[PDB]
Amino acid sequence: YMREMGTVELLTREGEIDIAKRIEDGINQVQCSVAEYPEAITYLLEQYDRV
DNA sequence: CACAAATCCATTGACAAAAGAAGGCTAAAAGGGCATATTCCTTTTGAATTGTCCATATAGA
Numbered sequence: 001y002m003r004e005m006g007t008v009e010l011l012t013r014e015g016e017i018d019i020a021k022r023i024e025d026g027i028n029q030v031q032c033s034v035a036e037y038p039e040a041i042t043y044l045l046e047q048y049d050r051v
Numbered sequence: 052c053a054c055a056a057a058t059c060c061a062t063t064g065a066c067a068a069a070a071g072a073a074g075g076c077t078a079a080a081a082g083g084g085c086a087t088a089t090t091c092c093t094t095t096t097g098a099a100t101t102g103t104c105c106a107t108a109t110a111g112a
Contacts, residue, residue, distance in 0.1 A: 002091055010090070
């Protein structure tokens with residue numbers, strides 16, 4: 001385990017910021033893909049009524 | 052050998068204890084959420100197999 005974790009190198013602070021921006025990009029892409037789906041709204045409407 | 056009485060087995064009935072449940076409770080058990088910065092652990096003996104040279108037989112030059 002120590003070897004396989006030692007091959008990978010650490011991160012720079014700006015590096016971590018880059019990775020975080022990548023994650024936001026992914027999550028926003030998936031939220032937009034959900035947004036182009038009408039039943040994505042229908043399910044939330046039904047659930048609110050349930051509450 | 053029949054008729055008169057004391058002694059048995061059965062239901063009425065009620066009555067108290069006991070248990071199966073149900074709810075109301077409370078102790079407890081299990082999640083979840085934490086944002087100055089944390090970067091690589093602490094005795095031999097023998098046999099059988101496996102990896103290492105050696106004899107050697109053959110094939111080209």
